[PDB]
Design an enzyme around this catalytic site. Structure first.
Site, mmCIF file in Angstrom:
data_model
loop_
_atom_site.group_PDB
_atom_site.id
_atom_site.type_symbol
_atom_site.label_atom_id
_atom_site.label_comp_id
_atom_site.label_asym_id
_atom_site.label_seq_id
_atom_site.Cartn_x
_atom_site.Cartn_y
_atom_site.Cartn_z
ATOM 1 N N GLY A 162 0.802 -1.207 0.000
ATOM 2 C CA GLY A 162 0.000 0.000 0.000
ATOM 3 C C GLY A 162 0.838 1.260 0.000
ATOM 4 O O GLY A 162 1.628 1.487 0.920
ATOM 5 N N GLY A 187 4.974 1.100 0.266
ATOM 6 C CA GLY A 187 5.634 -0.096 -0.205
ATOM 7 C C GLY A 187 5.097 -1.301 0.542
ATOM 8 O O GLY A 187 4.005 -1.259 1.097
ATOM 9 N N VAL A 188 5.899 -2.367 0.556
ATOM 10 C CA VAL A 188 5.542 -3.643 1.170
ATOM 11 C C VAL A 188 5.989 -3.685 2.630
ATOM 12 O O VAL A 188 7.000 -3.084 3.017
ATOM 13 C CB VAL A 188 6.175 -4.808 0.383
ATOM 14 C CG1 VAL A 188 5.458 -6.102 0.683
ATOM 15 C CG2 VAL A 188 6.188 -4.510 -1.102
ATOM 16 N N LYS A 231 9.886 -3.341 6.497
ATOM 17 C CA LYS A 231 9.145 -2.338 5.733
ATOM 18 C C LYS A 231 10.042 -1.837 4.605
ATOM 19 O O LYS A 231 11.055 -1.176 4.862
ATOM 20 C CB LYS A 231 8.717 -1.173 6.633
ATOM 21 C CG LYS A 231 7.812 -0.151 5.970
ATOM 22 C CD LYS A 231 7.502 1.017 6.893
ATOM 23 C CE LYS A 231 6.668 2.065 6.200
ATOM 24 N NZ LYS A 231 6.102 3.021 7.187
ATOM 25 N N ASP A 243 -1.215 10.164 11.861
ATOM 26 C CA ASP A 243 -2.007 9.073 11.295
ATOM 27 C C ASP A 243 -2.459 8.062 12.358
ATOM 28 O O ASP A 243 -2.280 6.851 12.194
ATOM 29 C CB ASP A 243 -1.195 8.368 10.204
ATOM 30 C CG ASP A 243 -2.046 7.451 9.321
ATOM 31 O OD1 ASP A 243 -3.281 7.706 9.275
ATOM 32 O OD2 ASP A 243 -1.472 6.492 8.699
HETATM 33 O O1 LIG Z 1 1.220 -5.007 10.908
HETATM 34 C C1 LIG Z 1 1.882 -5.625 11.697
HETATM 35 N N1 LIG Z 1 1.391 -6.851 12.258
HETATM 36 C C2 LIG Z 1 0.042 -7.298 11.859
HETATM 37 C C3 LIG Z 1 -0.151 -8.814 12.076
HETATM 38 C C4 LIG Z 1 -1.659 -9.188 11.854
HETATM 39 N N2 LIG Z 1 -1.789 -10.176 11.046
HETATM 40 C C5 LIG Z 1 -1.207 -9.875 9.833
HETATM 41 C C6 LIG Z 1 -0.811 -11.094 9.021
HETATM 42 N N3 LIG Z 1 -1.756 -12.176 9.254
HETATM 43 C C7 LIG Z 1 -3.055 -12.165 8.475
HETATM 44 C C8 LIG Z 1 -3.358 -11.050 7.709
HETATM 45 C C9 LIG Z 1 -4.538 -11.015 6.982
HETATM 46 C C10 LIG Z 1 -5.418 -12.132 7.019
HETATM 47 C C11 LIG Z 1 -5.100 -13.256 7.786
HETATM 48 C C12 LIG Z 1 -3.940 -13.303 8.512
HETATM 49 C C13 LIG Z 1 -1.633 -12.601 10.645
HETATM 50 C C14 LIG Z 1 -1.590 -11.430 11.628
HETATM 51 N N4 LIG Z 1 3.222 -5.138 12.051
HETATM 52 C C15 LIG Z 1 4.180 -5.769 12.957
HETATM 53 O O2 LIG Z 1 4.018 -6.775 13.538
HETATM 54 N N5 LIG Z 1 5.337 -4.951 13.018
HETATM 55 C C16 LIG Z 1 5.107 -3.796 12.134
HETATM 56 C C17 LIG Z 1 5.917 -2.664 11.807
HETATM 57 C C18 LIG Z 1 5.430 -1.699 10.930
HETATM 58 C C19 LIG Z 1 4.118 -1.851 10.331
HETATM 59 C C20 LIG Z 1 3.622 -0.871 9.470
HETATM 60 C C21 LIG Z 1 2.225 -0.802 9.271
HETATM 61 C C22 LIG Z 1 1.772 0.182 8.464
HETATM 62 C C23 LIG Z 1 2.692 1.095 7.881
HETATM 63 N N6 LIG Z 1 3.987 1.015 8.121
HETATM 64 C C24 LIG Z 1 4.474 0.072 8.892
HETATM 65 C C25 LIG Z 1 3.322 -2.957 10.653
HETATM 66 C C26 LIG Z 1 3.809 -3.928 11.546
#
Ligand SMILES: O=C(NCCCN1CCN(c2ccccc2)CC1)n1c(=O)[nH]c2ccc(-c3cccnc3)cc21
Ligand SMILES: O=C(NCCCN1CCN(c2ccccc2)CC1)n1c(=O)[nH]c2ccc(-c3cccnc3)cc21
Lengths: 361, 358
Positions: free
Chosen positions: A41, A44-45, A61, A157
């Site tokens: 999004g 990036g990824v 990230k 945000d």
């Molecule tokens: O999102 C983070 N965990 C979210 C984990 C939640 N499920 C995601 C994957 N799955 C799943 C997903 C969809 C359907 C079914 C299963 C299992 C758990 N993050 C971390 O754990 N460390 C981070 C550091 C930075 C960022 C971030 C976010 C936005 C913008 N910039 C950086 C996000 C995280």
């Protein structure tokens, strides 16, 4: 440079030379495997990976590095160390393919859940989160805002997708600083930051002299959504969100309009009285929660509580009780280990913030 | 005052004294029955009803009336009369228990579908709406913008939900004028109008000196969405939406930024080359459709086509073919009955807009 290799089971292992996020610049050989995407999004990824040695999960990230200026999120994450903010372990540069473009890789802590996903499971199943968890998550969010604000840094945000949760330990960590900025008085800032549903009224009115109290507005919107089970101020356009704010807060006075956007965008709103907040929520909603929201969702930006003053609110008194425990029986996470930096906005508040049982020798 | 009564089969009938929409103020006695809510939100409720003297379905939009000024949407509806704009048949005031608050009711035409729901049906079934319907709908949308722009009126909320459709007749009608305003040069207007996904860039940058070309931007966003099967510029924030725009159009030049919002929000964007428009859409996407998108989604608001110039685009040439018909065998709806008012932006265009056979 990164070296791709493999193991006996073809498990496939990437090894990079990264700089530690905090501390002196001593390059580190980091090896990780089991790379899987956790949503991309815009920027990036964001990948998940397992460190080969400790087996710990981490997040990566990957964003495209502008060769002009250094990345602003990088420079902020390196100054930050707080238990309720996702930590920057390492960072390194790489390149996907040819491109002649450089990528920045931020290696952060992994946390299995997000407030968004948790609150959505309860909402799909027609229920709300247990108030003990709403206290725990809100408190840790206000703590992280009080820390970053002490540096002048505004998140810009705050939304449930940016609030990570460990469900076992009830720990919450603020994430995603790709819009955060140090706000200096007299400098202008873009008004198109922050996600819909959580934008403060001065943002909707396009103000460019806004302070850190926009994050407090956002947090107030996260709290009300945990309590309501749905966003309190939804709308597909500025005008729609304003209508839903007027419905709750009442029509803003000419004075309140000036405090928000002094430019006065030249619009006339329908005159609606103030919805008594007690009629917004479920019947058994704790009065202290309704009190906290009303003090966070204010038109006048300066009238909103500060993050540190929010933690000290009576709605969090249960967290300060010596016998408070998580439902599963474990101890609560660290709640009272305040630093001098965190308290700098109002050091006398530590008479409330640090409960007596926490200062026992 | 409204007189609730019944028929003799147990049906319940409402009778009001309403003012015709487009005429001299000369109120009639209208009766209707079978009142169904078909959605509310913000402004108020929007019912559907059947006129007792013709069984014609009608929409009633019910909002709360400010006792200070007259309702701006009512004042605009009364001056509009176009085959691609929902007509205001009657309007009348009413209450509802005590409140001491007056409700305005707009009796509008009923149209059974919208572009949103129809689009959503093809998207969910992993198909794209066939180009003939994309031409028909886009064209009538541009006629409706050409008309209202000729009075200096800006709709400020062009989105698929506001594009009503009659599926049998292929007629599109613009609706929801609750944000519409006449834009006068030199007077500022609020930048928080217009739905997300469809906001023009100068709106995201908070400009207040924008022109009617914001509707053209929104229209092009509708066009791209009908071609792609999903919104072209999604994003929960202004930052997210601008990135999706930079991805397609490329980084705006310092010149183009000054044209949008001269204040310059004071932001630095990553430098991304222009995505070749032909790489945005499916392979079999007509080049004329891509060509029209590139002329609607422009950074510089004055570089965008006007609604009338877009009606004469080659993408709509099939509509001016004498033998065009609908896929269900019926004739195409009114497309060439232009008026002087509608063509006043650029009258030379009639020789294209009205084919030799009409
Ligand atoms: O999102 C983070 N965990 C979210 C984990 C939640 N499920 C995601 C994957 N799955 C799943 C997903 C969809 C359907 C079914 C299963 C299992 C758990 N993050 C971390 O754990 N460390 C981070 C550091 C930075 C960022 C971030 C976010 C936005 C913008 N910039 C950086 C996000 C995280
Ligand atoms: O939406 C208009 N037809 C759309 C009809 C489509 N339904 C039918 C199906 N479905 C439904 C199906 C099963 C159960 C429940 C619902 C709801 C939508 N409208 C007209 O036909 N005349 C109008 C005049 C004004 C406005 C308007 C809307 C918003 C703001 N301001 C004005 C809309 C219409």
């Amino acid at each position: 440079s990164m070296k791709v290799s493999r193991d006996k089971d073809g498990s496939k292992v990437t090894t990079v030379v990264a700089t530690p996020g905090q501390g002196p610049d001593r390059p580190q050989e980091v090896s990780y495997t089991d790379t899987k995407v956790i949503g991309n999004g815009s920027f990036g990824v964001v990948y998940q990976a397992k460190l080969c040695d400790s087996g710990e999960l981490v997040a990566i990230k990957k964003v495209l590095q502008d060769k002009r200026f250094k990345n602003r999120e990088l420079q902020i994450m390196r100054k930050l160390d707080h238990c309720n903010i996702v930590r920057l372990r390492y960072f390194f540069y790489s390149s996907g393919e040819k491109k002649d473009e450089v990528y920045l890789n931020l290696v952060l802590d992994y946390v299995p859940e997000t407030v968004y996903r948790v609150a959505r499971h309860y909402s799909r199943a027609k229920q709300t989160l247990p108030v003990i968890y709403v206290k725990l998550y809100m408190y840790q969010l206000f703590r992280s805002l009080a820390y970053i604000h002490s540096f002048g840094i505004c998140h810009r945000d705050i939304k449930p997708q940016n609030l990570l949760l460990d469900p076992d330990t009830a720990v919450l960590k603020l994430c995603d600083f790709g819009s955060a900025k140090q706000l200096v008085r007299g400098e202008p800032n873009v008004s198109y930051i922050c996600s819909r549903y959580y934008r403060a009224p001065e943002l909707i009115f396009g103000a460019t002299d806004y302070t850190s109290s926009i994050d407090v507005w956002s947090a107030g919107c996260v709290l009300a959504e945990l309590l309501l089970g749905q966003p309190i101020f939804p709308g597909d356009s500025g005008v729609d969100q304003l209508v839903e704010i007027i419905k709750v807060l009442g029509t803003p006075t000419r004075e309140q309009i000036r405090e928000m956007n002094p430019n006065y965008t030249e619009f006339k709103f329908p005159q609606i009285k103030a919805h008594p907040w007690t009629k917004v929520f479920r019947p058994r909603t704790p009065p202290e929660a309704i009190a906290l929201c009303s003090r966070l969702l204010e038109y006048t930006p300066t009238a909103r509580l500060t993050p540190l003053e929010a933690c000290a609110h009576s709605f969090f008194d249960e967290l300060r009780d010596p016998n408070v425990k998580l439902p599963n029986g474990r101890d609560t996470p660290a709640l009272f280990n305040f630093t001098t930096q965190e308290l700098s906005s109002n050091p006398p508040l530590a008479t409330i913030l640090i409960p007596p049982h926490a200062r026992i020798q």
